[PDB]
Design a protein around this nucleic acid. Sequence first.
DNA 1: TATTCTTTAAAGAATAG
DNA 2: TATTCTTTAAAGAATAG
DNA 3: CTATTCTTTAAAGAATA
DNA 4: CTATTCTTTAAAGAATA
Lengths: 133, 133, 133, 133, 132, 133, 133, 133
Amino acid sequence: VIGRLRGIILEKQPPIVLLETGGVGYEVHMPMTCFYELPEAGQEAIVFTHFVVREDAQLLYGFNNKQERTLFKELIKTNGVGPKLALAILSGMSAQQFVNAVEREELGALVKLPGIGKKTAERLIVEMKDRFK
Amino acid sequence: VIGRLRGIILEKQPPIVLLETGGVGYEVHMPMTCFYELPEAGQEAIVFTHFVVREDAQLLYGFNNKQERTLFKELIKTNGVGPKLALAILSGMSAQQFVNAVEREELGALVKLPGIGKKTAERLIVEMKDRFK
Amino acid sequence: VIGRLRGIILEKQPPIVLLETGGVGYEVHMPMTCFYELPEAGQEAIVFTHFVVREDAQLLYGFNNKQERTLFKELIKTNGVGPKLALAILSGMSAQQFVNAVEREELGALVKLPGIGKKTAERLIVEMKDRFK
Amino acid sequence: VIGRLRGIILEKQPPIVLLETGGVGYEVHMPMTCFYELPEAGQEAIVFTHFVVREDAQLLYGFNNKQERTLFKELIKTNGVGPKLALAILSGMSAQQFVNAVEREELGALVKLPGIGKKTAERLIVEMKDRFK
Amino acid sequence: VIGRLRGIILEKQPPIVLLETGGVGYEVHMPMTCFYELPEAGQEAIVFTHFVVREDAQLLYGFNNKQERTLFKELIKTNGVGPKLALAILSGMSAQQFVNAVEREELGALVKLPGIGKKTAERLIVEMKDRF
Amino acid sequence: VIGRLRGIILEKQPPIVLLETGGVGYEVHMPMTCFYELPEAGQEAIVFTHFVVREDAQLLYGFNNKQERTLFKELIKTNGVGPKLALAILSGMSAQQFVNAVEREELGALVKLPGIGKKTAERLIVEMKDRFK
Amino acid sequence: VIGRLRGIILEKQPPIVLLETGGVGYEVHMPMTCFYELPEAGQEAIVFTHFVVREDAQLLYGFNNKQERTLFKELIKTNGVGPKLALAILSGMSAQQFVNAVEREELGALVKLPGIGKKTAERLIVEMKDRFK
Amino acid sequence: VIGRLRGIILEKQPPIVLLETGGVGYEVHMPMTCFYELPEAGQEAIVFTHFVVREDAQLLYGFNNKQERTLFKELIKTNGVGPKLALAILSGMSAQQFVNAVEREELGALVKLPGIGKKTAERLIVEMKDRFK
DNA sequence: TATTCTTTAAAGAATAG
DNA sequence: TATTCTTTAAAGAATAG
DNA sequence: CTATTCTTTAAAGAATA
DNA sequence: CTATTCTTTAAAGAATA
């Protein structure tokens, strides 16, 4: 299980970034809004990752801060939320803003994000409100 | 997911090439006609790759140009076309020639390729014509 | 199959340790009581490992001594004893103490460990007593 | 797919050898009789490999010569012959001796090897005689 | 797919009833509270059923009224609600009472039933309120 | 495999009909337009059936004439056409009209049916035109 | 799920009996020692059954008394005890004798039965002793 | 498991026969040559059957004599011999003739049958010669 | 005509055309 | 008593005890 | 406004809380 | 001499030969 990658940025093409380590280039998926913090190509960068394995595919997701990775891992455990939707949420709201919205049940703050329906937002609040404690 | 490999060419035995990186040798499958561009053994080379995972096997395909990899990925999504047949198409025609043939429905230009039947060419045109747009 | 890792300690957060080798950081799970022997962060360390693969996840376990790894591999073959429970046993008792307890059938020595029920301890003795010989 | 490994011999414990490359130690299974050719521990060695993937396990097999690897790959395709039995055959007979025995149908030359039954030897000759041509 | 069974009652051992049709005896699972309506053994009875198939098992559930079967089928589509739990709900509340409780969000009316947790009751209301 | 059912009609609730045979009531799915031919409830009826089995469900489909069943079986072999869609086609057009439309490539005659898109109709013509011969 | 069968005995060929009901003949497996109680062929008989389903096969087991069926169902839940082995136990010992032996730990009373090993008998006692209560 | 069917013949369309029992019509597959012995439609008939189950399909095969069913069951256990091929063999040769040919290794007697290749015939003799004893 | 070789869903419910 | 958390075959046919 | 795309995938046991 | 361990795990389609 790859926990962190450090290497040279070869190419930047949202949502994918390519990092080279010892001649091996790794395809990393990243949130659209965190992409702005990556250095210019040819510079070294560091990214925290989570490794996903499926019967037909293997994928690697990256984040600029451990806080982001923690919230991502928690989201994907909620039924009906997969990696694509999870990245969308992190693109729309910062991790701290999301926690506040769930505790306050600001349904409208979630429904405005792309791809999230009314039923989905209700389900998220019901499930997530119990884990932050 | 390995996106690119850079290393020393150890052996060339069409259709397989062996690249060494840090003492690990990777088996790579490549189109017969792109094989002519690889440098002489012992020289460094760069190859773009796509990683395929199946219940009983893992395989790594390589291409000399991003254009080739893009068309390959699109072909394998078509039902009834797998990596073996896809490499044949890329061996027979250049990527640009293939696009022209599909848009023009030059059925004969495709059927002449080895391993492609009349029904197969009909299916390819019907599916691919809608994706290039 | 990864048999041993040698690298720099990046972070220590029981039960997980992060080792960096050539820019790749590996997540390793270790027994709570062996964690005390790891050097201070930034120093080099060596850990013997066992690689577990499942349909939905891949995991890497580490141990400070080959003796521990051998007993771990034997435990996980016993029905009902999974990697999580196996690490608990190794946390509570040294490998040598465990062997003695099984041969003597000291049921109380096992039942006192966290997460182990009376039925579980009975099952362990019945299965393990035949393998040490 | 790992095709070749080059590294330092860390430990030799038949049938397993441990090779270190860049701080990662790889477990490699090898034929009992080819093991005698490996250098002394601490020296560099080269081994040709084949990578086996299964739903519950991943394994890496190694051979000193490309000839051995080729015959191994052919054997494991025969129904009822698995990697364990395949290594036994390569331990008892050299690749050249095996070919001669099959073409001559020297049933006794095969049955004398450990773990091979009369039915198994008959099946091997029937299947293998057609592939060498 | 068996939709209805008509036959002679052979044995009654809650939660299972045994019905014989042409020499074949079918094991049927039923709600604990609907069991009281079944006639005396040896009499003919009619039961509406739903057929469940899994990789390792096949099961046949029965109900006295089409209303019950309809609500059962809807319950089992909710994530985390298995047939075992679904039968418990139908044992505790009538179909009409359940509908009212969901629309009114009377959380306490659900949590009192055996096996139903607070989180489960919240989940049920959120999912079911949209289907009726 | 149940090939035909003969019994008493118990209930008629499109698209499902319930037939009783010896105290067992079978749920049968039928085309919306063939439902008009079924006798009044309480009368005996005959229906030709096809039995579908899946990992999670078993289903039984019925038709008034062998011609209908034959075309249904051929449709479901085409990739992307499920039993639900197949019943829709048989509801919109008679079996004879469908054959004529495919041979003539009357794309508009198909696209007007509910649930069938332009791409779907193109795929159907390409695949079906070869089987009627 | 078939719970009971009543019909005419067509054939008796231990361990299989064939019962006809309405023109359908069902294959039933029965314990070797209960087979002696079945009436002469052509007479009616009653047998309690348990239905077993697997990915590749379906099987139907029968017993003369509910007591036997209950113990059979309990046995097959024990890990390592297959239906074949469970029928052997019921052939060697009556249900009542088995209960007495387990509670008394009369290991020799079990090991003497065909196909039962020492390890198996130990496992059986450990698991079954807790369920009769 | 349906072992025998008795009922009225509804339709005869090689290789399928349709038998009605209590209003349920069963599709039965039979050898081309045994089909000649079936009575005229509307008469009662008896057929011995074997029930095959797969993840995607259920099928029922029938034979006029227990001898045929016994040989069929044995053939399908041989690797590479499917039910389709097994019915072909029984169409070409009587059960008694087949046994004689295997014991004598009359390769030509088998290769002449449709669908059977030289490699297949060799494999059959090797496997079947050991079971009749 | 035999040969060996490949290639592997449907629904729902959200947003586009 | 509810909670969340884990853990996942059978056969054959060769060889030991 | 209707079609097209996409994407996502069990429950019971027996401990402990 | 009889028990214990182990180890291994589809077929049809439609091309081409």
